[PDB]
Scaffold this active site. Sequence first.
Site, mmCIF file in Angstrom:
data_model
loop_
_atom_site.group_PDB
_atom_site.id
_atom_site.type_symbol
_atom_site.label_atom_id
_atom_site.label_comp_id
_atom_site.label_asym_id
_atom_site.label_seq_id
_atom_site.Cartn_x
_atom_site.Cartn_y
_atom_site.Cartn_z
ATOM 1 N N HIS A 39 0.795 -1.360 0.020
ATOM 2 C CA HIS A 39 -0.135 0.058 0.173
ATOM 3 C C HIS A 39 0.787 1.404 0.193
ATOM 4 O O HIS A 39 0.347 2.209 -0.218
ATOM 5 C CB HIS A 39 -1.088 0.029 1.219
ATOM 6 C CG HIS A 39 -0.538 -0.054 2.381
ATOM 7 N ND1 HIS A 39 -0.153 -1.134 3.145
ATOM 8 C CD2 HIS A 39 -0.153 1.024 3.537
ATOM 9 C CE1 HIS A 39 0.164 -0.861 4.510
ATOM 10 N NE2 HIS A 39 0.062 0.553 4.533
ATOM 11 N N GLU A 70 0.470 -8.337 0.459
ATOM 12 C CA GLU A 70 0.525 -6.923 1.027
ATOM 13 C C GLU A 70 2.137 -6.676 1.052
ATOM 14 O O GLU A 70 2.494 -5.754 1.978
ATOM 15 C CB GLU A 70 0.068 -6.971 2.459
ATOM 16 C CG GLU A 70 -0.223 -5.354 2.711
ATOM 17 C CD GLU A 70 -1.036 -4.581 1.622
ATOM 18 O OE1 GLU A 70 -1.716 -5.045 0.916
ATOM 19 O OE2 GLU A 70 -0.992 -3.386 1.602
ATOM 20 N N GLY A 144 2.455 5.667 10.970
ATOM 21 C CA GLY A 144 4.093 5.964 10.760
ATOM 22 C C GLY A 144 4.837 4.376 11.018
ATOM 23 O O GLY A 144 6.072 4.746 10.794
ATOM 24 N N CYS A 146 4.414 1.292 9.620
ATOM 25 C CA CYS A 146 4.420 0.492 8.488
ATOM 26 C C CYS A 146 5.724 0.336 7.653
ATOM 27 O O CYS A 146 6.270 1.560 7.536
ATOM 28 C CB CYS A 146 3.067 0.890 7.308
ATOM 29 S SG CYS A 146 1.720 0.519 7.802
#
Length: 182
Positions: A39, A70, A144, A146
């Site tokens: 993402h 992901e 913050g 990720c």
Amino acid sequence: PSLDFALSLLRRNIRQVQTDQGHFTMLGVRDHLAVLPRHSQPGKTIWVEHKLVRIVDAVELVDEQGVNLELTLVTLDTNEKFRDITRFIPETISPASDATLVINTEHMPSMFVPVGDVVQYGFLNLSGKPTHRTMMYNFPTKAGQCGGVVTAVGKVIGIHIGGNGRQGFCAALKRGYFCSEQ
Ligand SMILES: *[C@](O)(C(N)=O)[C@H](C[C@@H]1CCNC1=O)NC(=O)[C@@H]1[C@@H]2[C@H](CN1C(=O)[C@@H](NC(=O)NC(C)(C)C)C(C)(C)C)C2(C)C
Ligand code: NA
């Protein structure tokens, strides 16, 4: 002591990056190859430590049946190669004790977060995308974190992708992801 491994990883393999989607931690794995949360959606260039860097190539990783993991693999137009850490990535996804999340973004500069046990979760709906091979830790991860790297006992086992305010979830790493033979 494990903070030794986590520090080494922070300095030699982890970079602050920014895409149009925001601030993320990036893990360089070997050569000019790095891994990000899907993402983050990297484009043609990416801010790496505040320098503009070309992406030669990017692939959104899937399981055998094409289900989202992901993760996105990027090939970076960098001058030097990352220390190869593939031998620290397990071949098969296993639970671990005493894990640390290693994070470095503008929102969350160089930090080591003890998250405890990391266990296989499996199926997750991620903004409406079926996602496989996720893991979970009982730590309230936040904005913050990720791309944050999950490490335990000299092993690199996951990339932080989400939270529910109580627990945190990572995409598992397998050595075969960085190797055409597996
Ligand atoms: C990450 O993108 C970042 N920049 O820090 C962020 C990390 C989250 C934010 C709050 N706590 C965290 O650990 N990840 C996301 O916002 C991901 C992202 C979009 C939704 N998302 C979530 O984490 C959401 N929850 C969620 O998906 N929960 C699961 C299913 C993982 C239990 C939410 C409600 C925005 C926090 C996608 C693509 C999954
Ligand atoms: Na991060």
